[PDB]
């Protein structure tokens, strides 16, 4: 599962960078809030879940 | 040395420490966008 673990962390980095770009634009301009708010909060939730999963997937 | 699981991500960490400086520089870029109003 080591390769699985590396792929998981790579996906974590990908998601984290995506959130990095998206969050200022979503938060600053609430013009597209209907889908933007869902996008940003779902990205945060996926970030938390992925971190928690990797926590165990380390061991 | 990184944990042998994380060693693949060695290059990324190599650019982490200098990231805060960019933030400061970023400010002027922000003040560049609004044209220093």
């Amino acid at each position: 599962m080591s390769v699985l673990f590396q792929l998981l962390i790579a996906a974590f980095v990908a998601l984290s960078f995506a959130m990095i770009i998206g969050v200022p634009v979503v938060f600053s301009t609430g013009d597209a809030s209907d889908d933007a708010n869902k996008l940003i909060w779902g990205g945060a939730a996926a970030w938390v879940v992925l971190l928690f999963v990797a926590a165990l997937a380390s061991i | 040395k990184l944990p042998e699981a994380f060693s693949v991500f060695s290059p990324i960490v190599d650019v982490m420490p200098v990231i805060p400086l960019f933030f400061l520089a970023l400010a002027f870029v922000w003040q560049a966008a609004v044209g220093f109003k």
Partner: peptide, 23 residues
């Protein structure tokens, strides 16, 4: 070697600026 990630971050910053700058 390491200029790739540094360039990636250099793209990341001003892009975040620009996406707001469009609106």
């Amino acid at each position: 070697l390491q200029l790739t990630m540094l360039g990636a971050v250099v793209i990341a910053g001003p892009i975040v600026v620009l996406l707001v700058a469009l609106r």
